[PDB]
Amino acid sequence: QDPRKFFPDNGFRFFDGPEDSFGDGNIPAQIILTLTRQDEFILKQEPVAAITIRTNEGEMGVLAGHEYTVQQLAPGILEVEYEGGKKDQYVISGGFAHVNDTGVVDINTVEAVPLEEIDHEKLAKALEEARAKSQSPDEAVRIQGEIALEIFEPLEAALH
Amino acid sequence: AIAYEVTVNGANLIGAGMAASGVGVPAIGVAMCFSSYMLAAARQPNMSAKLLPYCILGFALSEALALFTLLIALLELFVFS
Amino acid sequence: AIAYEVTVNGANLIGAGMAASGVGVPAIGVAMCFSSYMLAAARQPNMSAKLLPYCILGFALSEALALFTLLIALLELFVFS
Amino acid sequence: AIAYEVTVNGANLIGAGMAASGVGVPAIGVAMCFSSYMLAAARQPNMSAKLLPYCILGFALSEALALFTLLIALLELFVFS
Amino acid sequence: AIAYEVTVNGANLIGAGMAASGVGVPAIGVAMCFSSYMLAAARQPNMSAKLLPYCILGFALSEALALFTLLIALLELFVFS
Amino acid sequence: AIAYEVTVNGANLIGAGMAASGVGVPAIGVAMCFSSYMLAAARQPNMSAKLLPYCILGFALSEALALFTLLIALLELFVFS
Amino acid sequence: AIAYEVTVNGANLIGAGMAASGVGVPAIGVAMCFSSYMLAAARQPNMSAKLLPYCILGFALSEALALFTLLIALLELFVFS
Amino acid sequence: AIAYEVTVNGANLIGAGMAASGVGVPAIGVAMCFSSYMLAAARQPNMSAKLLPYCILGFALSEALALFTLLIALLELFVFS
Amino acid sequence: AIAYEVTVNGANLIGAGMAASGVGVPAIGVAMCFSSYMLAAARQPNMSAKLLPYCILGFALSEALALFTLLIALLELFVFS
Amino acid sequence: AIAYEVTVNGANLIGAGMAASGVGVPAIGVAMCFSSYMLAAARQPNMSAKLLPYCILGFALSEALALFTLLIALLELFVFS
Amino acid sequence: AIAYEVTVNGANLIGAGMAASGVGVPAIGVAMCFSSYMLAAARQPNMSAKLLPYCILGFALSEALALFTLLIALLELFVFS
Amino acid sequence: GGGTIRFWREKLEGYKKYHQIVKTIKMVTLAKYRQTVVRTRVRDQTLRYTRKALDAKTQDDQEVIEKSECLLYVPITTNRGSCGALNTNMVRYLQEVENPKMTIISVGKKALDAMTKVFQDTYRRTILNDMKQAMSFQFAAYVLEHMNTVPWDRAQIVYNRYHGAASQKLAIFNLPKFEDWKQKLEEDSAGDGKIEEDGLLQSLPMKTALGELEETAVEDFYNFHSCLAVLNAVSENELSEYAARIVAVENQLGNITGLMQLADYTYNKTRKELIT
Amino acid sequence: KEKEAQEMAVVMEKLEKEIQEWLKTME
Amino acid sequence: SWRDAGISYLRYLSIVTRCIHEVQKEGPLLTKNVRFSTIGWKSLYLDHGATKEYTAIPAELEKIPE
């Protein structure tokens, strides 16, 4: 018998993850952001001045040097403020935000699309449908309407 | 038995101190009612305006309890001989 | 044994201080009962209407204790000689 | 030795001040219970009806303590002389 | 030297006030127990049955310290004439 | 220098009032301990049995301190005249 | 009922002390308000300017209750003879 | 002037009622230390062997203060006249 | 009515204690303020400087209250006969 | 005017009670330090060696005050009359 | 009117008890300072160095308040009568 | 040689039709590969942090078979063949790894014919994705829901890594169970940070901040990151399928031409002989 | 009451003559 | 809510993603992204000689596994 011709690599080792160090000095003034939908990113280690996220407990803001905190992201939007005062918003579908003390943010979602690519006409027709779903007595429709509303109401608030 | 009615004219003042020991406590009730706004406004700024009535309401009732304590402590200084 | 019955009129007043000092404490109740509703409403705005009754209830049933503490400090100056 | 029994009538009232100070402290007990209900219902609305009994229970027991304190006050202002 | 034994009859009625100040401090305890049960069962409802004893068991003891504080006042007013 | 040895047979009682004011404060400790047990076991049910000994051991000495305070208060009525 | 009106001059002063003790209590509210501002602005730097008016207000009024409690304690030494 | 020395044989007791008020307030410290141990071991179960030394420490020394307070409330009744 | 003006010189020396009882409460405020600064700077160091002024402010004014309290306890000893 | 210098030989034994009422208040402010150590160690045990210097330092300087709150109560029974 | 100037010497000694009672409160501050520096130093060890100055500052000031309190309690036994 | 010559003619025409059919397959495959190579620009970024949660030192197999009670092996296979040596090498790895405690839920049609003939009773079922729609997060959620029918202690997601057009090698994701991952997470959060294996990252702050997170959210963390791992596996095997089929089709065309010159030599030789 | 206060009005008048008489000698 | 109803976190995220795809604008992005929500998948188990579907874990998100 051929002594184990096959020796497959470990797929995790291909990703150059960050080495979480304890720190010995100064604090960064801009964070290194990574935002990843399903597999493809949208931003690869971009320099950012700030980032504002939404969670279940409530909204949150992330400047550089922020403490280590891994945490949910509630379905809502996500604001990214670059160094030049500009901004960029992103509707997401849940995920996780991993913040390091080294100014290295890794946000990993299931979807991420800007506000520019969302319209109010195609949303005002979905909102009342979600509401009528929440009013139809049945678990298989009420929860679907609740979830759709959980995502839509932030967009109704932010598009205005 | 013997009977001695005495009118102490200094105890119109000691009490005015004790009541004033309870005028500063509702300050907590004020700050707790503004602090909880800031936090609630830092977690959800969209909810920054429809919470604010309850902030002022709790501040007002706490300040009103302090004002009643003070109305005693002044009613216990000037109107009594 | 001799018996001296003394009526100290000033003690009409000292206790009213001692009671007034316990009029500001319920503010920490009231404020908390509001400081919750903000934070709760920051945690789930869709429950903001289902929770205001259980806020006003503690508000009122703390101000009740405050008013029952103040009824003593007003039923001790003017009704007692 | 000599024997001077003395009856100080005003002590019918000073203590009623002190006892009146312990009526406002259970207000924190009521608020700490209603606020907890608010926060819990915010964190889990499905449980909002499963926790309401304990809210009323804790409030009632705290209010009963405050009421015993108020009994020692009002039963010390009037019936004693 | 001289030896004046005086028997004051108002200490029957002041200390009972002082003790009556301490009947409320167990209320915040009862409330903290019930509030903790609320928050815990919100965190994990499946434990709400394994936790209800230590809430109940935490009231009855924390309540007893009030009753004894209420014993003294009702053992210092009525029997100590 | 004229020596006046006064023996006040009422001060036996005021003390037992003041001490009673401290009998309720360990109640919040007892409830703190049970509350912490609840929140811990909610955070981790598997650690429900390992921590319960300390939940018993905190009550068992907070209550002991309150019992010593009550011993002082009751031993200031029935043994001293 | 023999009538002895007495003026205890030292009661000008003791009561002021009883008021001075209530001057430091609002400091905890001041600190609570500024602490809330800090923690909120950490939760959201972008809101750091929209919360500051709700601090200075909730501070100053909470500080006002420290002035009255002091004014009495100065309205009770210098003017009261 | 005229030198009137007085010895009040009741002050043996009144102050013992003050000291016994400060014997309960370390109970909240005991309960705080145990509560913190529970919450830590719920936060890090395998650290529950490395923290318990500090708990047992902060429980004892806190308690020691109470004992010292209690010592006065025993050193002020039975040995002083 | 018979008029006895009595001046208790020793009352220069008890209110000063009652004031000193409340000089340490603002220490809690200062500590709360610096502690909140530490926690916020932990959460976001870049806001630290932007939050450092308010901390200092929340220290001084709080502290200033204590100073006024302390001032009373120096104005109650050295100037009042 | 008439001049009575009165020496109360029992006051020695009352201030000790009021002083010992504060020996237990540093206890909560000691157990907070060890509680914080436990919580922090849970959050990061790697740092659990670098922190206990800032626990010990928060014990002695938070226990020594009790000593200076207690030594008075031992400097006020045994050296003074 | 009649004029009785009385000097109670024992008032050198009851007010120091109250001040010494107030010496223990700032401990709750000092710990709350260190208790924060631990937690912060857990959340952000890289900022463990830029927080210790604020820790020592808050501790020193919370201690200086107690130092002035104890200075009252000590300046009221030795120089005054 | 009438039968002979008509045989060579039919052979020639059959190969000339088979050539253009295979060329059509190649064109379709290029049109599906040039869409999905876009992933390469946008790769190696989403599991930048997942590994710190789930990665670990290389645990030997002979000890893990003892430590556990039911393993799981999820091979990502293809819905249609002509890939080359992807499916076969996966099966060779699995029958090299064969142990008394294994359970196989695969992904593809070609894990349904081979495995059941190789792994009779361990092999449970498969999952299928007709590739009309790009693969989603919820496909990997479906895969996780099928994985969680087994009370497994470890899951080895086998897949094919596209290192390049010429290199489609193997790769694995060794996912742990939840109730073991959590215990190891606590045990590693307590002790100091000393990496025990080169190439492994230090993640002690990660594992403390996760301790800061409640139970439901830690379960969600585990599920989310396991799903992202599964998703990258599916995407990589898709790209590798479309990158190996072109190779296994080019060599098919080479072999077909090698057959066709033989046919066209024997045809013309037989024809010339029949004329002579 | 009127009979109670009439003599009591003299009771205190008697008391104030004496008190001045005891004090103004020492005073 | 959806938790005690029995659906998992992943189904919830996928539902939210479907909603975002429902509302978002027409263009190359919707053309790209609806592919990440539309359902095509199955599970099949080979019986003695033939295939059969494992109908216990459904693809549609309105339903619950059983």
Numbering used by the authors:
A (entry chain H): 17 to 176
B (entry chain W), C (entry chain X), D (entry chain O), E (entry chain P), F (entry chain Q), G (entry chain V), ...: 24 to 104
L (entry chain G): 3 to 278
M (entry chain 0): 141 to 167
N (entry chain I): 2 to 67
Source paper text:
The mitochondrial ATP synthase is a membrane protein complex that generates most of the ATP in eukaryotic cells. The translocation of protons through the membrane-bound Fo part, mediated by subunit a, drives the rotation of a membrane-embedded c-ring and the attached central stalk, which together form the rotor. The torque of the rotor against the stator subunits induces conformational changes in the (αβ)3 headpiece, thereby triggering catalysis. To reveal how the mitochondrial ATP synthase is modulated by lipids and organised into a dimer shaping discoid cristae in Euglenozoan mitochondria, we determined the structure of the ATP synthase dimer from E. gracilis.
Symmetry expansion of the pseudo-C2-symmetric dimer particles was used to classify individual F1/c-ring monomers into rotational states 1, 2 and 3 and resolve structures at 3.0- to 3.9 Å resolution. Using masked refinement, maps of the membrane region, the rotor and the peripheral stalk tip were refined to 2.8 and 3.3 and 3.8 Å resolution, respectively, enabling the construction of atomic models. The C-terminal helix of euglenozoa-specific ATPEG1 (H5EG1) extends 50 Å from the membrane region into the lumen, where it interacts with the N-terminal extensions of subunit c, which together form a ten-stranded β-barrel protruding ~20 Å into the lumen. The N-terminal residues of subunit c (A24, I25) form a hydrophobic interface with hydrophobic residues (M148, M152, L155, I159, L163) of the amphipathic ATPEG1 helix. The position of the lumenal H5EG1 on the c-ring β-barrel remains largely unchanged in all three rotational states, suggesting a mechanism of transient rotor-stator interaction during c-ring rotation. The extensions of OSCP and subunit γ are conserved in Kinetoplastida, suggesting that the observed interaction is a structural feature of euglenozoan ATP synthases. Together, the matrix-exposed subunit γ/OSCP interactions and lumenal ATPEG1/c-ring contacts pin the F1/c-ring-complex to the stator, likely providing additional stability.
